[PDB]
Amino acid sequence: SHYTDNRYKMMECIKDAGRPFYPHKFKISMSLPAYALKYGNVENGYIDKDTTLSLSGRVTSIRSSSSKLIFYDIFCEEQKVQIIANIMEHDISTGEFSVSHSEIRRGDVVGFTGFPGKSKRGELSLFSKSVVLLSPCYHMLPTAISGLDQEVRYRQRYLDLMLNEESRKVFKLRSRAIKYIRNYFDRLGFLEVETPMLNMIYGGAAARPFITYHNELETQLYMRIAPELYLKQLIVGGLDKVYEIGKNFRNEGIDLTHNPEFTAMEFYMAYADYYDLMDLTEELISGLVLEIHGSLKIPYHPDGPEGKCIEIDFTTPWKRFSFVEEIESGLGEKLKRPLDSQENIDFMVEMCEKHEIELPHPRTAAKLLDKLAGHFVETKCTNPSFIIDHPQTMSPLAKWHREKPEMTERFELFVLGKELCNAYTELNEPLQQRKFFEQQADAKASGDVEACPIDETFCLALEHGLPPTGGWGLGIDRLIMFLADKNNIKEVILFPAMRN
Amino acid sequence: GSHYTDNRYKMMECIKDAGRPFYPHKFKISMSLPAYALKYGNVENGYIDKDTTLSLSGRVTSIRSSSSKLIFYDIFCEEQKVQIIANIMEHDISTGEFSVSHSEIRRGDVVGFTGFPGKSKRGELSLFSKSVVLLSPCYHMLPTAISGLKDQEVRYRQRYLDLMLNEESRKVFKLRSRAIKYIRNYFDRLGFLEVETPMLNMIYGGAAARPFITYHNELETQLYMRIAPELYLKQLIVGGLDKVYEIGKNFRNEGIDLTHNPEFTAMEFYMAYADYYDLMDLTEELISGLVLEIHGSLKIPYHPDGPEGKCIEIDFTTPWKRFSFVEEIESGLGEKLKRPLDSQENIDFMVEMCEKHEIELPHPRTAAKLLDKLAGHFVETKCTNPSFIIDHPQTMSPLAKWHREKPEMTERFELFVLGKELCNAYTELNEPLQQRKFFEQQADAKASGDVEACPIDETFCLALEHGLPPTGGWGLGIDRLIMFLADKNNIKEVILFPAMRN
Numbered sequence A: 001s002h003y004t005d006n007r008y009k010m011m012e013c014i015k016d017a018g019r020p021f022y023p024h025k026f027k028i029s030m031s032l033p034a035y036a037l038k039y040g041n042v043e044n045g046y047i048d049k050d051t052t053l054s055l056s057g058r059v060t061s062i063r064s065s066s067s068k069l070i071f072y073d074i075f076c077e078e079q080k081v082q083i084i085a086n087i088m089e090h091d092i093s094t095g096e097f098s099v100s101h102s103e104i105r106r107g108d109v110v111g112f113t114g115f116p117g118k119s120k121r122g123e124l125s126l127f128s129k130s131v132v133l134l135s136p137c138y139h140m141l142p143t144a145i146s147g148l149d150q151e152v153r154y155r156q157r158y159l160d161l162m163l164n165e166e167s168r169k170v171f172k173l174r175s176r177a178i179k180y181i182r183n184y185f186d187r188l189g190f191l192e193v194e195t196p197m198l199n200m201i202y203g204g205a206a207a208r209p210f211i212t213y214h215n216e217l218e219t220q221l222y223m224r225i226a227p228e229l230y231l232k233q234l235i236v237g238g239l240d241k242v243y244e245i246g247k248n249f250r251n252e253g254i255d256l257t258h259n260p261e262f263t264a265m266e267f268y269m270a271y272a273d274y275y276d277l278m279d280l281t282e283e284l285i286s287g288l289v290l291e292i293h294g295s296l297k298i299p300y301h302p303d304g305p306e307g308k309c310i311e312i313d314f315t316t317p318w319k320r321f322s323f324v325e326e327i328e329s330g331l332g333e334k335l336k337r338p339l340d341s342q343e344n345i346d347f348m349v350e351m352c353e354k355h356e357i358e359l360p361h362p363r364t365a366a367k368l369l370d371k372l373a374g375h376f377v378e379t380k381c382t383n384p385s386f387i388i389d390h391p392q393t394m395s396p397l398a399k400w401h402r403e404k405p406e407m408t409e410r411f412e413l414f415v416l417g418k419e420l421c422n423a424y425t426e427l428n429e430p431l432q433q434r435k436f437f438e439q440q441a442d443a444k445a446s447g448d449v450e451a452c453p454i455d456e457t458f459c460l461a462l463e464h465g466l467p468p469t470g471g472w473g474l475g476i477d478r479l480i481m482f483l484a485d486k487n488n489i490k491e492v493i494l495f496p497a498m499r500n
Numbered sequence B: 001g002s003h004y005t006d007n008r009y010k011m012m013e014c015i016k017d018a019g020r021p022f023y024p025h026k027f028k029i030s031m032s033l034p035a036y037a038l039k040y041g042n043v044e045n046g047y048i049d050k051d052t053t054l055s056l057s058g059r060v061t062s063i064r065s066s067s068s069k070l071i072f073y074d075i076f077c078e079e080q081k082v083q084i085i086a087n088i089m090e091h092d093i094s095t096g097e098f099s100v101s102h103s104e105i106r107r108g109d110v111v112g113f114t115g116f117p118g119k120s121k122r123g124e125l126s127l128f129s130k131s132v133v134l135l136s137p138c139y140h141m142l143p144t145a146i147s148g149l150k151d152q153e154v155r156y157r158q159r160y161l162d163l164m165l166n167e168e169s170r171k172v173f174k175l176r177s178r179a180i181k182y183i184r185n186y187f188d189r190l191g192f193l194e195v196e197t198p199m200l201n202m203i204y205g206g207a208a209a210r211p212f213i214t215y216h217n218e219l220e221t222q223l224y225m226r227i228a229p230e231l232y233l234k235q236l237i238v239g240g241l242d243k244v245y246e247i248g249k250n251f252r253n254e255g256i257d258l259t260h261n262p263e264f265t266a267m268e269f270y271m272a273y274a275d276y277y278d279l280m281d282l283t284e285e286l287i288s289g290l291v292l293e294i295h296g297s298l299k300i301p302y303h304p305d306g307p308e309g310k311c312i313e314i315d316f317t318t319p320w321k322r323f324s325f326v327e328e329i330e331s332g333l334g335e336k337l338k339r340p341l342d343s344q345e346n347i348d349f350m351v352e353m354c355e356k357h358e359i360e361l362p363h364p365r366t367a368a369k370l371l372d373k374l375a376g377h378f379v380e381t382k383c384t385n386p387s388f389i390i391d392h393p394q395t396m397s398p399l400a401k402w403h404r405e406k407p408e409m410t411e412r413f414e415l416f417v418l419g420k421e422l423c424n425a426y427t428e429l430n431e432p433l434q435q436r437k438f439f440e441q442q443a444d445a446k447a448s449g450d451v452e453a454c455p456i457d458e459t460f461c462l463a464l465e466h467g468l469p470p471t472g473g474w475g476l477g478i479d480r481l482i483m484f485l486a487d488k489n490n491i492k493e494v495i496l497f498p499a500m501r502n
């Protein structure tokens, strides 16, 4: 607009007039919090002309009460400080009073020097002697996010962070929560590792990958969909307890709970099974909730702050729902065995139509089972609840159930119908594992884009002996959503993927 | 030529069909092997507590026998070895015949044992076992050490073998964890906030590197993997977060060698109201303190040619030498560069200089790439101890603020150690007019064939138009820092799964 062109013209006039133009360094006397923590309990009207302090922040308010007085609010590091600029106090060596202040606009980052104290009304203030424009804002900013549509908050995240305290709070909470989680596992003697995000062969999750290419090696590559296959090789290597926190990359759908890159944690624990992992998940998550909120019952608004509120209860232990048993309890009928037979496939198709459940493609036993548990089970998980004992056909890297035929020692954690955790007793028998890979390879051949190719390097690693192991993954972003009561993953990711 | 793996598959089939233990789901250990040694490592020779039954587990590193009645194992777990003494008179027959139980065990198997704690008469910390369980067999005949491998490339391609046999490799990755924690703590204590910015970018930028290209099908849009987080991190300072850092992977689609892996771990931080003078001071305090933490002093060994070859000492005592970019080139040439540095007269001059001193000519022959080539020849070669090369020309520093005293230069530094780049930092450019102009010049170089030059990023220019406060920013190559702390001359030693050819 004209505001931007005029600002560029102003800065040109300032550069040519020998006046301060983007100064390289401004030495602040102290932070704005610190200034408030030192002078916040002074008597009203107190000043100290024996002390000169330099302060800086972004201008949020300019009010010229008269020709001799200008009131500024600056803001920085979560603290507001008022500046009172009296013409009688102005340092004429920096320019005439009207000139110096004529160059300051709301939104500018600026520095003031002056004397500390509080005003007569009692508001913490600096009684400024000069003003330095450090970095002008070339755009007319709104007062609050109300003056922006609200997808600007996602596409220009600096504007959300500059005007909206609620958003700064979410990302501070995100860091506090990841700190808590690392500590939890560091205390247990885990070793944090990093495994490749560029893979020759992708695997470890049910997802379509991103495809790329390395020009000097002349080979196609994939971004990792999960670190699982590498992490387990470190247990073969004897590291005993490892974890990784980083990005996965999945090339599929974007919605309220899906962003193409998302932060995941995986850990592998030699000699655990999935029963140890349940106890561990409850201890980790209830403790973090308690740490963050001060109690285990926390509000959650699925439709935003003026919509209905749900109170999620994280009190332990959590409800277990057996995968197949609860589907058959919803159906009033038993699935057909073997679970992956054509008869069962047909029966599940028929039940999905009967219960108005969108059919998947292909109509693999695994995808159909997913649809039925999406309908009959994932809908009962308002409080954190474990969905346990997933069928083998949908769990190619999960070890078989020691007692239930066709099942595995797997669990998923759901909160308010949304997946948070996925874990199992790790499959460590190479023969079965190869066969489950081949069934995956054939499903990919039959239209399952989310099916992974065989990874011979992983089979060879299992042939060197994976000790009995429990492994586990957590979608960190979705965890932040519950901890910060957002219902859109875009709220808990700084620069989410936006359509252009 | 190796029936060992076939027979082991056959052995395990027999076991499965005979109803014998076959890959038990859960083996509950009484304690870890390190806890065991802590509890019992000081008992007398010949001590045995037959009132205490314990379950231990580890990988078998050794099987020896004196009779058909007495078998000696060594098991290893969590950095500790414990001897298992299996006497037939103690053998629990409900688990099977003694000879049958132990003929299923091979060196390399993950196995559990149950028995009585104590020490052999010769004084070895031992469990006197009553049973053995095969938890996870090893189908391959293992070497005793990484010396028994066919090639040492096996250590990178099958890193589980390296970790299994070689304490030295295990120590490297513990040192890597320890150093990263130290670094996080240093910045957490300064009030920094850790952030995560996108590794999928619609527009790559923030470094001189060639990107990987990809595609998101639902968005139907081409994407780049990030070469650096710098342009998103600076937006967060515009945002007012004041002090941010990010520790994560960068992806660069270029050459692989001793100091370059296509993905590597970098740290970037941005500090409102710092300049590069502040950043040099912080670099010195952070890096020297970390070095002291690991090594107990500031003078540490390095073997650029291996552990039996020559050993040099790297001196981290502060303050570190400063080399001025253009001056040090000119002292090594014996004459001055032409001004402006980016003029055709100076491009031509610099071509004459690379040919005279037999410096491999860059392509394309941009002023920046020519100047980089001279610096790498005349300046980086002097950086044995940690040293700052400072005040880089603007033509090679599109995101660095102009130098407050030296025309054509910027307020930038790179940290070199043993001639390898460890850090890159500058007073950040926050003036949108010039930033746009240097962006257009980068697109001009990218057009002449400079695969390192980045295209203009309009989202970032618009961010700077909202006011980036004076700021200092900084990047650290963490893999290369570990190379120096751990004394490795190959980046493959400090990355668990490095990129390997076919």
Ligand SMILES: C[C@H]1CCC[C@H](C[C@H]2Cc3cc(O)cc(O)c3C(=O)O2)O1
Pocket (backbone or CB within 6 Å): A207, A250, A251, A252, A253, A257, A258, A259, A260, A261, A262, A264, A265, A419, A420, A421, A422, A473, A474, A475, A476, A477, A478
């Ligand atoms: C690592 C796993 C553990 C299971 C919960 C969670 C699932 C995961 C699925 C997923 C897929 C995808 O394409 C994009 C996403 O943001 C997510 C996510 O947040 O969560 O993460």
Ligand SMILES: C[C@H]1CCC[C@H](C[C@H]2Cc3cc(O)cc(O)c3C(=O)O2)O1
Pocket (backbone or CB within 6 Å): B209, B252, B253, B254, B255, B259, B260, B261, B262, B263, B264, B266, B267, B421, B422, B423, B424, B475, B476, B477, B478, B479, B480
């Ligand atoms: C973030 C930066 C700051 C300067 C040091 C270091 C440079 C970086 C260059 C680089 C390029 C590349 O293609 C592969 C690599 O492993 C590296 C590396 O380790 O170091 O990291």
Ligand SMILES: N[C@@H](CCCC[NH3+])C(=O)O
Pocket (backbone or CB within 6 Å): A204, A205, A225, A226, A227, A228, A266, A397, A422, A423, A424, A426, A471, A472, A473, A474
């Ligand atoms: N790879 C799994 C997480 C770990 C499952 C247990 N090994 C996922 O992406 O969902």
Ligand SMILES: N[C@@H](CCCC[NH3+])C(=O)O
Pocket (backbone or CB within 6 Å): B206, B207, B227, B228, B229, B230, B268, B424, B425, B426, B428, B473, B474, B475, B476
């Ligand atoms: N982006 C730089 C590091 C930060 C430079 C200061 N902004 C690099 O990758 O080398």
